[PDB]
């Protein structure tokens, strides 16, 4: 990305609906970590990287 994509976030979402998650580190055009989930219906949603439920959703996918 060329700028931050996430002005607002969700504290989590239904883990069963998640197709993929992109975790973007801070870079030259965005100073904060951004987490964008792509759902099975193709919808995209910004997630809070600091949220414990977000970190647990990633863990459940990583171990599936």
């Amino acid at each position, epitope marked *: 990305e*060329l*700028r*931050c*994509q*996430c*002005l*607002q*976030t*969700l504290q989590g979402i239904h883990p069963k609906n998640i197709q993929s998650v992109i975790v973007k580190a801070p870079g*030259p*055009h*965005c*100073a*904060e970590t951004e987490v*964008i989930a792509t759902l099975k219906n193709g*919808q*995209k*949603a*910004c997630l809070n990287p600091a949220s414990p439920m977000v970190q647990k959703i990633i863990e459940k996918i990583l171990n599936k």
Partner: antibody
Amino acid sequence: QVQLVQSGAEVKKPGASVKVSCKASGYEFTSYWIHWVRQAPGQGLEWMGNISPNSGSANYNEKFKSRVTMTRDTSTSTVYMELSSLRSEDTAVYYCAREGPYSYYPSREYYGSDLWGQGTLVTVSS
Amino acid sequence: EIVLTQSPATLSLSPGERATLSCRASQSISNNLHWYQQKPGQAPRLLIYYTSRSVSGIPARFSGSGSGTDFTLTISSLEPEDFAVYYCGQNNEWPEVFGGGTKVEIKR
């Protein structure tokens, strides 16, 4: 009223610091990025950086990142820009401007900056 | 960093005439190109966003178009209040960048 109200004019010596405020009213503060843009006398527009009213995380133009800090106060819907190690070339009108609304659903289609503060003149000289 | 180049630097026209202002980007900014008007002692004012989209309360005579890295602001018929400076600004990427401006002057 739907507005961005900035602090008054400033006069500084080289090497000093300046802190300008931009108070937002009449709209959902968390729905819009707030940018800082400056204009030297008789010149064009230059982006300083911006801040997320939600996370309070700022993004800076690399030209200023080492001597600029942007912060936000959720309780008063106010954003601040502190510019340090001031030089005469920083003499300009500094504006704050909002861009949005945006939600948790990202897009690559952006709005322009539709609401601007009245500007704050900062004069830097010996 | 993107460079936005506006042309012409000055446009001298009579009220009633069509004004055509150009903005060219150094590289793709997709359609994330916006146009602003600025009058002396005032902040810039948004006219058109995302190349061609209408802004609430802006008169119909302002319209925008684009193709590739080339953008155009058209004022179909100049009114006396339209003689001012116009800037294009991109926000496809950070830092935002603005063009150098086009001054629309009254020909007499």
